Amino acid sequence: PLSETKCTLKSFTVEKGIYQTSNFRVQPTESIVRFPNITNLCPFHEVFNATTFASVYAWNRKRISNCVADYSVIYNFAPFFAFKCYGVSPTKLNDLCFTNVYADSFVIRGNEVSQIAPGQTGNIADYNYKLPDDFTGCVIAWNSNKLDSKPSGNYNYLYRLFRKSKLKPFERDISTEIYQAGNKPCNGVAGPNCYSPLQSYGFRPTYGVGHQPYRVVVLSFELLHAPATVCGPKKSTNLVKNKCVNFNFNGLTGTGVLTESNKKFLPFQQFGRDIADTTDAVRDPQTLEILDITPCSFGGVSVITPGTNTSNQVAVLYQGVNCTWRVYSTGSNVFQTRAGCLIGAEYVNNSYECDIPIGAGICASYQQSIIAYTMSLGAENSVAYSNNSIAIPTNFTISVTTEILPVSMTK
Amino acid sequence: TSVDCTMYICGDSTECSNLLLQYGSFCTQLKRALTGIAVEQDKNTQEVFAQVKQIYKTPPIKYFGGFNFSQILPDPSKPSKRSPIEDLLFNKVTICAQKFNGLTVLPPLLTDEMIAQYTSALLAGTITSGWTFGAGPALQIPFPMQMAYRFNGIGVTQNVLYENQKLIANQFNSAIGKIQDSLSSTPSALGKLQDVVNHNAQALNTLVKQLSSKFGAISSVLNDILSRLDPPEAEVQIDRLITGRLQSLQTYVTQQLIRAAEIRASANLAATKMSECVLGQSKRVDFCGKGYHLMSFPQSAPHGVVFLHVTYVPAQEKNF
Amino acid sequence: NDILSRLDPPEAEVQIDRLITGRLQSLQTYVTQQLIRAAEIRASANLAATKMSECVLGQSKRVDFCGKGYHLMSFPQSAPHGVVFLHVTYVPAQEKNFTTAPAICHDGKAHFPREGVFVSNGTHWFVTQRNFYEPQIITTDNTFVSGNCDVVIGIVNNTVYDP
Amino acid sequence: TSVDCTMYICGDSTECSNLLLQYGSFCTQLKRALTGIAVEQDKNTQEVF
């Protein structure tokens, strides 16, 4: 630590006094992941591979209940074209559990695939469809020219481009949708301005690249919610006691040591957020056991030394850390001042005048050895007191003393 | 107090420290500022208290002309070596989760025991030796011998004391008896030290609650962002949270350097009054209390000092 | 210089925008620290000017304000960005413990010191001042009379001399 | 002097105040400090007058 002091103070000589360095910061031993034992096969093939799906005007917005799925079911389709995703990068949609996945499937053209991106306007992003622009979910598209396309032409599929008023994100609009525009009442039967909001597509397999049928599934969800709905398989492991450890409890993680229950809770109340708005108490995903999280203790390392011109025997102190404990290896002597742990120095019952302060009336000095001692207030003195005695001085001295006062610093 | 710049800004994440080091040259100044305010603050107490390098003790027998001082001298039968006035000042004046975010507090170099010993030695010097002990060796003087000279310092002939010392003793004993119930009657008189304590406390609390802030980020948590996004993107979310936290540090330590300034001035003024109202009989009017000043008693307090000024006011007058 | 040689100026303000801000906050921190240190050294200069006015231009009889103990006189001296004071003060060295009394009985009346402390070697009685031991003979012009020998405690029967 | 938190930073628009609340706990200590400076500044006349 003398060399660390030289490193910190960017000089080769240090004269005296207390200094600062980094902390202990003990490392976690292992990591604990806990999952509930309810692990089934979650059906995703019914939205991926099936018969000819509906057009974009009809949404099969599917609520996927509590299940267990991974990306292996999704991975079955090589012709994935629009692999672009938002919110979570596509390499890590595994081993994290959502709360409400929103799956909606439709069939669109090749050039309409790029229109599903948020914050833009297009054939789909017009009155036909409005979507939330934050879009924590993703879009997955794959070509289906060998199944959806028909030799006779797929003219049955429609889309409601020409609806009058605006759409809001995540709304359902399927009705007759009569068109009443112009400076005349159309009544749906006039003839001048009886425009049709629904138009056909046309699918024959001799086209360009931008007119091919594409299956698109869109997912919309959010995070930071206590229940978990669906995520990949992970072998749960047992917890540990009184050990610095990482933990992952179905989503949110942390690092610290664990303690048994001391409080009552409430039988749907499982989180333990404190006045500091930090998680410190939680219950097991598999059992009804309250456990308390307290993070592993920090250090705070300081160094004490005499003059480099004098000697090189140094000592270090750890603020707040009890030793009596988790300080790796020891040295010649360990002391347990209320300021903190101290090693590299000895202790005496004597009292001498302090040269460098440490804390709580403790000071370390140099004898060939570094000695830590309690505060010496000065020479102990008492004066006799009597009802009829006066001390009167006869000889005296004059003394000169110095005082140094700053006046101004450099302009 | 002391802060760790790495632990407050970032958790156990290497990449956050990597984006901290490209700033690099900020929290070293934070370190030097907190060490500077620490060495400035703990050095205040010696010139307030250790003005004498000769610790004294009280005589066992008190023939103090009928005076009583049992309320201010420390009681040996008390488990602590403090006066009952010190006990009232202690119990009339009133964390781990705050510590556990890299927010450390440092214990003072001086604890209560030896500053109580300093106050007891100061009382021993000012009772049995008068005020000459602030110059050289302590010269023992009887107390009614000293009060006559203190009257002579305020233009009073010493015959007045030797005529009315019984009434002086009764008045002073009654006043000391009154001052205990005066201090214990209301806690509004102790508001001059609760303000510093709770001002430090709420400043630390508004510092530590600043972590849960949506500083242009998807989430205020650092770990879930790492599990959320790729390392090229979301650096634009990390760095804004870095800036919003370091500006909070800047506003905190600027306010701390502001608040240390008047604390140093008040400590200097208290040391000046330690010099004047205790070690001498200053004729500066209203500087040592109200009216013509006789003498003062110092008593320690949590992070503070309190002075009992005994002064002099006339009661009955006539026209001539 | 290199970043203007590196980037098309439409994306310069995309790139060279924030280091200007960072230098601005760094210099703001420097300015704030300069104000703090300037206020501290301004208070120090006020204290130095006050002690220059007190300790030098007069015999300031405040204790510890102009040195240690009873202050006599002072020497000001310059220093690079500073001032240094040489205080010449008084301090007693040797002392003796003597027997006292607040008043003197003589002919049934009480004698009080006009100025000084009553002391005795054991056989005779004398008076001094509060800092030196010079025994003076108790004479009616060295003291004064107010009252008699009942209200005052510690009084001793003795003699006084009339010139 | 005193300064209002919301109306100075943002005009008569709701969404600027919505975008204001992300920092949230920043102008509270500013208002507390201005009331402080006001209260000891009004206090300063008592011990001198």
Numbering used by the authors:
A (entry chain F): 295 to 618, 633 to 675, 690 to 733
B (entry chain G): 734 to 827, 850 to 1075
C (entry chain F): 978 to 1140
D (entry chain C): 734 to 782
Text lifted from the article:
To elucidate the disparities in binding affinity between XBB.1.5, XBB.1.5+F456L, and XBB.1.5+L455F+F456L (“FLip”) spike proteins with ACE2, we determined the structures of these three spike proteins individually in complex with hACE2 to interrogate the conformational change on their RBD-ACE2 binding interface. As we expected, all three spike trimers mainly showed two ‘RBD-open’ and one ‘RBD-closed’ conformations with one or two ACE2 bound. To validate the hypothesis, we constructed recombinant RBD subunits of XBB.1.5, XBB.1.5+L455F, XBB.1.5+F456L, and XBB.1.5+L455F+F456L (“FLip”), and determined their binding affinities to hACE2 by surface plasmon resonance (SPR) assays. The dissociation equilibrium constants (KD) demonstrate 6.4 nM, 25 nM, 11 nM, and 2.0 nM for the four mutants, respectively.
